[PDB]
Design a binder for this molecule. Sequence first.
Ligand SMILES: [K+]
Ligand SMILES: [K+]
Ligand SMILES: [K+]
Ligand SMILES: [K+]
Ligand SMILES: [K+]
Ligand SMILES: [K+]
Ligand SMILES: [K+]
Ligand SMILES: [K+]
Ligand SMILES: [K+]
Ligand SMILES: [K+]
Ligand SMILES: [K+]
Ligand SMILES: [K+]
Ligand SMILES: [K+]
Ligand SMILES: [K+]
Ligand SMILES: [K+]
Ligand SMILES: [K+]
Ligand SMILES: [K+]
Ligand SMILES: [K+]
Ligand SMILES: [K+]
Ligand SMILES: [K+]
Ligand SMILES: [K+]
Ligand SMILES: [K+]
Ligand SMILES: [K+]
Ligand SMILES: [K+]
Ligand SMILES: [K+]
Ligand SMILES: [K+]
Ligand SMILES: [K+]
Ligand SMILES: [K+]
Ligand SMILES: [K+]
Ligand SMILES: [K+]
Ligand SMILES: [K+]
Ligand SMILES: [K+]
Ligand SMILES: [K+]
Ligand SMILES: [K+]
Ligand SMILES: [Mg+2]
Lengths: 82, 142, 212, 129, 166
Amino acid sequence: IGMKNSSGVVVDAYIPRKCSATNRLIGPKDHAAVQLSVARVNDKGKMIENNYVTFAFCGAIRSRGGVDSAFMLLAQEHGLME
Amino acid sequence: MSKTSGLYTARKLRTVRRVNRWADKKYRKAHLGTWLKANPLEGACMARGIVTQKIGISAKQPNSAVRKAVRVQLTKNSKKITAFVPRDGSITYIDNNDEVLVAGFGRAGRAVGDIPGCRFKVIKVAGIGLLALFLRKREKRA
Amino acid sequence: EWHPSTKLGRLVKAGKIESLYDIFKYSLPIKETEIIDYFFPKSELAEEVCNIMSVQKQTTAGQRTRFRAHVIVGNRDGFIGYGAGVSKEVANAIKKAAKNARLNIVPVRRGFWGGKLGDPHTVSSKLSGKCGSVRVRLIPAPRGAGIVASPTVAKVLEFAGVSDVFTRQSGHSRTLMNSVGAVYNALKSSYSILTPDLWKKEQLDHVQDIRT
Amino acid sequence: VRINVLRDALKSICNAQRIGKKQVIVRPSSKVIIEFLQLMQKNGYISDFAVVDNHRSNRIVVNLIGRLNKAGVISPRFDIPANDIEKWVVNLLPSRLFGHIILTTSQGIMDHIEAQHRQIGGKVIGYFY
Amino acid sequence: PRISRHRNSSKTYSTPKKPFTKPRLDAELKLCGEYGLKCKREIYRARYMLAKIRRTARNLLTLDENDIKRRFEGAALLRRLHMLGILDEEKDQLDYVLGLRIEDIFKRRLQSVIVESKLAKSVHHARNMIKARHISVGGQIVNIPSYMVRISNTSRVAIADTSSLA
RNA sequence: CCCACCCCGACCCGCCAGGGCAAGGCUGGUGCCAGCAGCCGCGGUAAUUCCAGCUCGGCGAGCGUCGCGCGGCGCUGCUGCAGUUGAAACGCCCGUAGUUGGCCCCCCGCCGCCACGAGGAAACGGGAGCGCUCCAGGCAGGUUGGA
Ligand SMILES: [K+]
Ligand SMILES: [K+]
Ligand SMILES: [K+]
Ligand SMILES: [K+]
Ligand SMILES: [K+]
Ligand SMILES: [K+]
Ligand SMILES: [K+]
Ligand SMILES: [K+]
Ligand SMILES: [K+]
Ligand SMILES: [K+]
Ligand SMILES: [K+]
Ligand SMILES: [K+]
Ligand SMILES: [K+]
Ligand SMILES: [K+]
Ligand SMILES: [K+]
Ligand SMILES: [K+]
Ligand SMILES: [K+]
Ligand SMILES: [K+]
Ligand SMILES: [K+]
Ligand SMILES: [K+]
Ligand SMILES: [K+]
Ligand SMILES: [K+]
Ligand SMILES: [K+]
Ligand SMILES: [K+]
Ligand SMILES: [K+]
Ligand SMILES: [K+]
Ligand SMILES: [K+]
Ligand SMILES: [K+]
Ligand SMILES: [K+]
Ligand SMILES: [K+]
Ligand SMILES: [K+]
Ligand SMILES: [K+]
Ligand SMILES: [K+]
Ligand SMILES: [K+]
Ligand SMILES: [Mg+2]
């Protein structure tokens, strides 16, 4: 949601994205951050148009190479892999 | 932790501070007591004395000039000082027996600018303020 | 008029992008200064020259002199920027500094000290910054307190839209470029700190992504 | 030798989360550490934990969800009158609106908001935010 | 001793820390233009009288809404700030005190009140008329330009019945 | 007792500056001399700094100079400094006083600790209420009050 006025209105200019792996906020000028999306076939081995899954990764998780395993673990939780 | 901690170490924390306080030159100058002894004015704002001589003093390296000053004997402790006379043409009011009120240059006993060995300055001559003598507001007798 | 050299600048020319906060939300670089100038038409930005320094390179025949200029921009309502430029002539150095200042715009998050009545009026919470040997602490302050900072820091805090702030500076702050760099870095981290207001999980919907 | 088990536990947890780990083991355990983790849990900063017995000083396994900016202890445990709490709030905490200073009082372990809700003092043991 | 040794006295203004700052140097003379201020001290006094009422509120706001100190002193502060007209009725929250400026204090001077009701063409003419005992407050002749007029006593500001302008 | 204040009647600035720190720039004289300059620096016969004239700046019935305390100063550091190379880890081991010491039983006693009371001085310091015409004040006042 974000910060609220005393009455109940969000006085926040924008909401940063959160990492799908480490829950950290992305922030502007973090140019190593990537958002990417997966097909989610569901239909006899063929994809369905404009129906994807989409994750995001901050630069800290990439700078050490943690994404190859964390992305796989995230995929095994959404029924896209095993 | 490079400093002692612990709930019962107040005595040590106080002893350390008492000992290391003396390592600062400012604190040691203002609190030891040797500067008060050696101070010609004896810890006062100003002091009066009689002129014993008139002198000229060379400036330091990058400047070139002859500064004008007077050797003064102090009334209250009979010490020898030299005091500077500012303000163009002012050395002409200083006869060889002229009670002078003398104050400091600032910097609390350090030499200033380009005058070697000068820490004091004349502010009054034979009862009359030297600045007002320069500005032509009062005049000496004769 | 200007013809974009980048796909983002080509997208901005049409009605594709509605505000800067979408470009910050998916954090992409901005390579043309008229992308910035399209969102802030004609002097909602304040531009002030902090410093001009003369630098010398020693050479067989004599010293070579150039100038380095430091420039800050902002809109008084939540955007700040800081650039630098080097050139033979002062005018070109200042021109380069102003361009670099426009390409470094960042958003600044504000909040409430104590009472949450009106608009956010101080920093959202404590902020810290480092540049060179300089370190800075921005501390939230009540209403009417003002901007309690050095005159160098107070201008950056004024352009940023922060009404009330306390400040502490450590290191050799007489070095003006590192002072402004530290304050800029402190403002730039304001949207990367997790607060409980932001804990709630969300779904990413690729339909809105500007597709890099 | 080992003196402050809570300090080592909190350093280990902060390291593990800064890496981006899901779980972390801290040993030894103690009553104070369990009270501190219970308060952190109830505020929502950590997930489940488990104390595993070994007929010695046990171990603890802590589950992490990336909400901890920092956690530390204050040594020694200075005592605080009821009216000095706020002079500590603007010292350790990033704001006056979120964060927690943990006190031990004769009415148990509790954060500072409840300490001024019951208008009492105690001794400071640590903080998280 | 003598009895006079037991009399109190106090300074009522604070001078700024950096004297030679340009933006507040000209901001400080726009104030001397919009009000017939004699010298900078009358600005300093004003800021000093703000700096105390700002210190009180921030002390109570750190407290809890149900403590007796808040309930007693904040009510006293608000009741005093509403009579002088430095603060208006619609803002009866202790948090509305913090956003106060000096201009609010300067607007309740007698020199300012008589200008508002147009008894004087300008503020300088107003100061001159004040010194000439030409104006009364509630039937009482007041000689002080810096006089602070309560909202009770602002219906009743006139030229004095004894006067050469009557 | 006289006077000051109040009431009624008739007459009637100055002190420091102007290159930077730090707000504010043309003519004459002097030519490393006289002098200035807290610190950077200025002056060698074209001086944004000396001595003057004009203009302009700051505070103002008050301004400048000297000395000291506090602040500046996280350059004394409990909060809160530094110790590879800038000043700074004893050549090393043992070891008393001192400081510090894992985890565990709850619901007793004795410390510490937290809270609330009792008891003792006012003035000062905060602070409720009150138009000495305002004010520094004072404890006033129009059934009252000095909480
Ligand atoms: K150290
Ligand atoms: K240290
Ligand atoms: K030590
Ligand atoms: K102990
Ligand atoms: K020491
Ligand atoms: K006349
Ligand atoms: K007359
Ligand atoms: K007359
Ligand atoms: K001069
Ligand atoms: K000095
Ligand atoms: K200096
Ligand atoms: K200097
Ligand atoms: K000449
Ligand atoms: K100091
Ligand atoms: K201090
Ligand atoms: K300090
Ligand atoms: K250290
Ligand atoms: K040495
Ligand atoms: K040495
Ligand atoms: K050495
Ligand atoms: K050693
Ligand atoms: K030793
Ligand atoms: K030894
Ligand atoms: K030993
Ligand atoms: K031993
Ligand atoms: K021992
Ligand atoms: K012992
Ligand atoms: K010790
Ligand atoms: K001990
Ligand atoms: K030990
Ligand atoms: K106690
Ligand atoms: K307690
Ligand atoms: K008594
Ligand atoms: K009665
Ligand atoms: Mg200090």
